[model samples]
Target: VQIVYKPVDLSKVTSKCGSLGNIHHKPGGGQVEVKSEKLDFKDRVQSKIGSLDNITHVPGGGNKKIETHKLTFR
Candidate 1:
């Protein structure tokens, strides 16, 4: 999964799998983008997918920022 955020507010994006015909992003409240291939998959049938919570700090008149904290599964 790839995450891109800006200064306005941190937004979450997701892509739907066309072959499986499943709705991803178990936990809602973000943006959803459907792609051709699968980004991530669940091992068990009803396993809980990981969550991503990132905080981007934009410095004064600079493009570089700091991102801390990243959780993944498998």
Candidate 2:
């Protein structure tokens, strides 16, 4: 599962660190920043896929496994 950062109202965004439309959720398990303009949110935006354990390859491969996680941002 992938979560795309879609700012409802780009004009209503106010981050103490970076600018709007800065966070982006890319496909194929990867992410990158477009730009940093918001001055309300700073430091850094951590990654959610800490462990690449989703959609595992098994069956004729090896043992079995499942996938699960959550992304809670303020």
Candidate 3:
């Protein structure tokens, strides 16, 4: 199940699986700047994956995103 909440609240982000599972509030209740430019792109990709759950039973499953991009590749 893919889901997205626009204007995301960092405090509300939660991971239900893996080692990071749980909700945590930022210490100062404010946005933190990313210190590394290389990680910024990785963060965006991970955010998309995190929003989507497993695709085991869905036909044409895990490659959907790749296939969609292939069609629109420039």
Error of 1 at 6 (Å): 13
In model 1, how large is the Cα lDDT of residue 19?
A: 56
lDDT of each: 0.50, 0.47, 0.36
List model 2 lDDT by residue over 25-60, tens digit each: 544766444554654646787645335544533233
Enumerate clash totals for all models, in the order shown.
Answer: 2, 13, 0
List TM-scores for all candidates, in order.
Answer: 0.16, 0.14, 0.14
Model 3 segments more than 4 A misplaced: 1-28, 39-44, 48-74
Task: Give one digit per residue, the lDDT tens place, for model 3 in 1-74.
Answer: 54454554344333343343344443434443445344346443634322323332422223322212222323
Top-lDDT structure, candidate number: 1
Lowest lDDT sum, 10 consecutive residues, model 1, at: 55-64
Candidate 1, residue 45: how far the Cα is off, in Å? 36
Runs in model 2 lying further than 4 Å from the true structure: 1-63
User: Which of candidates 1 and 2 is the stronger one according to lDDT?
Assistant: 1
Model 1 CA lDDT for position 18 = 38
lDDT per residue for candidate 1 within 5-68, as digits (tens), equals 5447675545444353333444445654545555566675664345344444433333445667
Model 1 bad stretches (over 4 Å): 1-8, 20-66, 69-74
